[PDB]
Design a binder for this molecule. Structure first.
Ligand code: FAD
Ligand code: FAD
Ligand code: CL
Ligand code: CL
Ligand code: CL
Ligand code: CL
Lengths: 437, 437
């Protein structure tokens, strides 16, 4: 019916590759346009187990397993500052806000058939996923950037694909914005809404032969994600395995802390890192295999995540902050849910907003909990570990850390978090008070 | 000067990736068009050391070393039929045509700084090379097939690039045909000349946990290329390491032997392989990780390997037969030499045949020796091992097996081979006679 494709995916990352796999697997004729030549370096390494049902559902899990990514059986938090001595009657703290751990297997998660998910080289990871989408029948273009999308009619779109400085017109019944922090349709259509509260900022690189025992004694916990709290305001470091020897390490903080630093990005990394001697010395002993990258300006909302002949997924739709290592999960799950709506949209031949309403509701609520949970971490700071460790909140907290964010249940935790916040907020005498953020 | 690129490379294999690396490294604005999404399966695994000077010269060697390809320190030939007992005064045969070996380090090769080259997964190999070409500045398109090249004027060409069924016009001062056995410009311009003498044919796949000690006792020789002669006319099997566990195994023979077999490709493999019990049982014990592939119709010449605003390289220019595992070497060296001419062609702004004359002469002579050497192997059959093992011819033979085929020296070996051929040819009494092909 003079359309080149039913669907045209913009961007070939996790959000794009997955959407393409869900469509080609369901018989829909789609295409992915990736502007970069893969493999391409990308921050965002530590997966969360809500990825695996999707990875399984699309048929790519064993190809991913053959990549031999370091397994992520769980997640840790450490702080040089053990907290207040009182502990406000919190049932279990084995080290007084100093250390906290959690195994992903401690809660059963529908779809998960595993004790572990992966920490990935995001270059390798994304190639394998796009290759896979390719192998399922999806047409994939690399080195071909999408300049703009012409919105002619409901169920009728043209896409401006460029090859350097040479345009090509691609007719489609719709587009999928699976762009990154780039955000093609959010900028073009003016949907992008920069976050008012969040002004966080990240600096990271890779570190070879980085002794992961710098973070813990036990060899069972060596390949967990470690989130090292730093004494600076709203500051923490990630430690993520990439290979057996290579670790990815990034500081995250308020830009206000960096810009007042009067330092280059490299120097700020070491200076913030030097506030925790074990981390610093392990990093100094290890080998930088990559120059330091900045990641900034990444906290943004989106006025509309769907429309007539368009839907936004993954980072093209939203990003908050990388604490809980959940963004790739959202990429795959926003790609899963929006595909369910798209597969029916081509069947019904009905690409107006109404056909994508189920995705809109599902994602917005999935962003809400994800968003709220990130805010309350920064509000609690090191006091977050009291909730992680306490049985009354532990597996309710694990639910979120696992990425089970889509269901429409409230998640009573997030109010119980809010109450104990408000109890301390109110009272500046409160012993927990100076540890807040 | 309203050209999108100085050069447009057709195809993103070893020949294409390399050309692109040589051009981008020398400041020339080029582009590679690969029709497939990488990684993509490709036969042609065992490299020959004439690749390494090029791999080094383009700056990709360490990226290749990080791929951890099995090292190829040398090459072996085995036959269940030990030959005639006479040995016609050949100075050294340690097993009577039964076994022969050679180490690549036994002759010094200019550019080689190594005792070994690699056996590669050609999927991985080609991605790393095209990525590399990318990183040097070359623009790379994947999923974009080149339909045809319009030859307007010397130094002025248009290329028809398609995206499914959607054309795009790309202006260029010239094109490089780095296509495969596909052969775009050879078919379009009618340069393709199917080989009259060679009608060889190959069937192969991968085999996991394939005990490489089936071929030899010693653990030093376990990862050599092994060429197992079979009793059938012009028949031999390759054994090439791909990983620590995976081996690539292919039978090569006259199609006449297959077509008279009355068997499917799978069945012929096992039947020809069963003529050598150690090989068969090691293969039967191992795990097929891939279905069997046919490779046929690959012996072809080319009327013209260069022209006004065009040059053919690698398999787009020629292929003979895969005995000496030398085709990827030709891909890289034809890409090296033709780049030397192209780099000057853009400098001089002169893209007529005359500017590529140095490549034409160099390749044609490099094909000649490569071609002759392949013919005399098939003529000698198992008697080839007498030349491999004898000091008088050993390192002169190694020169060819190493891929030092470009120089314009005659290579006295190939006549000395021819004489001893003609001595046996003439006389059907001759003891060596029934072992010829
Ligand atoms: C500092 C930091 C740390 C993080 N840490 C983690 C972590 O530990 N764990 C985790 O799960 N997540 C993490 N994230 C989030 C994660 O990186 C993203 O959520 C994830 O990459 C989203 O995938 P995506 O496909 O939606 O977007 P991307 O992965 O960014 O993919 C977008 C793709 O679209 C392409 N593209 C863009 N524009 C165009 C165009 N016009 N035409 C064609 N192609 C285009 C891009 O080249 C890119 O390949 C982190 C983020 C930051 C900033
Ligand atoms: C049975 C067999 C065994 C072999 N064994 C060996 C061995 O052991 N060792 C060895 O060194 N060599 C071997 N070879 C030879 C080797 O495979 C080739 O010589 C080598 O692949 C040549 O590289 P190339 O880039 O010139 O062509 P290719 O590697 O074939 O690359 C060509 C590329 O161009 C692309 N292309 C084609 N048409 C178009 C178009 N219109 N637009 C855009 N892109 C296009 C293709 O998709 C492909 O990616 C063997 C060959 C055969 C048949
Ligand atoms: Cl410490
Ligand atoms: Cl995240
Ligand atoms: Cl045998
Ligand atoms: Cl070859």
């Amino acid at each position: 019916s003079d359309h080149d494709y039913d669907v045209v995916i913009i961007g070939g990352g996790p959000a794009g590759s997955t959407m393409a796999s869900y469509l080609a697997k369901a018989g829909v004729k789609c295409a992915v346009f990736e502007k970069e030549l893969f493999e391409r370096e990308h921050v965002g390494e530590s997966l969360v187990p809500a990825t695996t049902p999707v990875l399984l559902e699309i048929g790519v899990m064993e190809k991913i397993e053959k990549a031999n990514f370091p397994k992520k059986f769980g997640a840790a938090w450490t702080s040089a500052d053990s907290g207040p001595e009182d502990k406000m009657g919190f049932q279990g703290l084995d080290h007084d806000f100093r250390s906290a751990e959690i195994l992903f297997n401690e809660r059963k998660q529908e779809g998960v058939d595993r004790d572990f998910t992966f920490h990935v080289d995001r270059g390798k990871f994304d190639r394998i996923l796009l290759e896979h989408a390719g192998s399922l029948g999806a047409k994939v273009f690399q080195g071909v950037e999408i300049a703009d999308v012409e919105f002619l009619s409901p169920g009728n779109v043209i896409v401006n694909a460029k090859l350097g400085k040479r345009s090509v017109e691609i007719k489609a019944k719709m587009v999928v914005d699976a762009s990154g922090r780039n955000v093609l349709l959010g900028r073009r259509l003016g949907l992008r809404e920069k976050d008012p509260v969040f002004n966080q900022f990240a600096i990271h690189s890779w570190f070879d032969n980085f002794d992961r025992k710098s973070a813990t004694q036990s060899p069972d916990k060596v390949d967990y994600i470690f989130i090292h709290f730093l004494p600076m305001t709203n500051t923490w470091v990630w430690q993520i395995p990439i290979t057996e020897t290579i670790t990815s390490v990034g500081v995250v903080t308020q830009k206000q802390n960096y810009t007042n630093s009067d330092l280059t990005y490299e120097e700020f990394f070491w200076e913030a890192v030097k506030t925790r001697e074990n981390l610093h010395d392990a990093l100094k002993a290890s080998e930088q295999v990559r120059p330091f990258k900045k990641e900034a300006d990444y906290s943004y909302g989106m006025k509309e995540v769907c429309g007539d002949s368009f839907v936004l997924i993954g980072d093209a739709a939203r990003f908050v902050d990388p604490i809980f290592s959940s963004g790739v999960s959202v990429a795959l799950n926003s790609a899963r849910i929006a595909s369910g709506d798209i597969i029916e949209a081509v069947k019904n031949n009905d690409f107006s907003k109404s056909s994508f309403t189920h995705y809109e509701g599902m994602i917005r609520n999935g962003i809400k909990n994800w968003y709220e949970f990130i805010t309350l971490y920064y509000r609690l700071n090191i006091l977050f570990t009291a909730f992680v460790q306490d049985p009354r909140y532990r597996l309710d907290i694990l639910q979120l850390l696992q990425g089970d964010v889509y269901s429409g249940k409230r998640l009573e935790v997030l109010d119980k978090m809010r109450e104990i916040i408000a109890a301390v907020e109110s009272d500046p005498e409160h012993l927990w008070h100076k540890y807040l953020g």
